[PDB]
């Protein structure tokens, strides 16, 4: 029951944590991301 | 003693004093085009 609760809370679909994926470099976000609280950053270097 | 009539301005590619120049410039090497494509991925963790 507890593990099914974990699977329902985090939505562990066939391909990872929903649209979110975790790789070697870091988070890869295949969904929108609206945050309720202020975020922080260090740089924002868009790719050429 | 000598006269040297040379082009400039809009005559950059023109020299008008005959010095008998045999200079034949080479050709620019063709650089391989490098388009960058980032399509989405399903998790390779599906394999494991």
Curated annotation (Swiss-Prot), chain B:
Region annotation Disordered: where it falls in the sequence: 22-45
- Share the record's PTM remark: N-glycosylated.
Instruction: Give membrane topology per the record.
Output: Single-pass type I membrane protein
> Please, which domain of life does this record's source organism belong to?
Eukaryota
Composition bias, Basic and acidic residues: 34-45
From the Swiss-Prot or TrEMBL record, state where the protein is found: Cell membrane; Cytoplasm, Cytoskeleton; Nucleus, Nucleoplasm; Cell membrane, Sarcolemma
Kindly list the residues the record flags as site (Cleavage): 13-14
Described by its record, this protein's role is as follows: Transmembrane protein that plays important roles in connecting the extracellular matrix to the cytoskeleton. Acts as a cell adhesion receptor in both muscle and non-muscle tissues. Receptor for both DMD and UTRN and, through these interactions, scaffolds axin to the cytoskeleton. Also functions in cell adhesion-mediated signaling and implicated in cell polarity.
Q: What is this protein called?
A: Beta-dystroglycan
Which species is this UniProt entry from? Oryctolagus cuniculus (Rabbit)
């Amino acid at each position: 029951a507890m593990t099914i609760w974990i699977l329902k809370v985090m939505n562990f679909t066939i391909d990872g944590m929903g649209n979110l994926r975790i790789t070697e470099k870091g988070l890869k976000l295949e969904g929108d991301s609206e945050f309720l609280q202020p975020l922080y950053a260090k740089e924002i270097q868009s790719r050429p | 003693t000598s006269i040297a009539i040379t082009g400039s301005g809009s005559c950059r590619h023109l020299q008008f004093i005959p010095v008998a120049p045999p200079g034949i410039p080479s050709s620019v090497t063709p650089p391989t085009e490098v388009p960058d494509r980032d399509p989405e991925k399903s998790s390779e963790d599906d394999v494991y």
